Amino acid sequence: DRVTTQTAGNTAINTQSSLGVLCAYVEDPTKSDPPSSSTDQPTTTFTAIDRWYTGRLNSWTKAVKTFSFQAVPLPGAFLSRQGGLNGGAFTATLHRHFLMKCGWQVQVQCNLTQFHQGALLVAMVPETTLDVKPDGKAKSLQELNEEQWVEMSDDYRTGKNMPFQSLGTYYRPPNWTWGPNFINPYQVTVFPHQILNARTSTSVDINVPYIGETPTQSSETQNSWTLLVMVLVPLDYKEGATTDPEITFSVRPTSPYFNGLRNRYTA
């Protein structure tokens, strides 16, 4: 009933408190047709990229407040290697193809005990720049491993701090107040989500298809999804219990359609 083993390629993952795969926006998000914006023959899936790529994510202490999120860019994590999420044969194929059109299928493991309380809001959030510092630069692993959980200020609730083109010295620099890549933290449950509660499950299961403004997007620029782990209830436990439960995540690209083969990406 709740023991579901999800074999894919040569990497089968298991979960004995499974709530069920949250297939998003369609019945089967695996089914997808080739891109209509490529006259060349696309590189479809093959048996070394159809597997569960797994990397760690930061721990979840008691000091983490409500709505302190933590964002995983997909496919931004395969390229920067956030959390040790090394793609292997997928990243070595993603760097050599210019356009990439895939749908994801994630699973976040955080095993609490029956004496802990707390709830994460794991949600595949489309089209957000939550991984980018407000000054334009994307975050590096030295920068993620010092804040550990990016707290929900009012700059994220309003979208005041999304990255921008500086107007220059000619225009008077205006008082920025809002930007559409905000987070409304109370409405993240509209996204494809499950709640990683401390009393119903250890792992959540989300399955999202390819979305994007174009029928296929570039490989080195896109952030079409964002695995967002948000703390709705802070972790609390009596002393003696297992402090700082780990959080991992396991990402599987469902049916990718690579296009535009060239040499390895050198910025």
Binding site: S36, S37, S38, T39, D40, F98, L99, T214, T216, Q217, S218, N259, G260
Partner: peptide, 8 residues
């Protein structure tokens, strides 16, 4: 010269 483009 082929037509390899992210837009129609």
């Amino acid at each position: 010269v082929p037509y390899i483009s992210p837009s129609d």
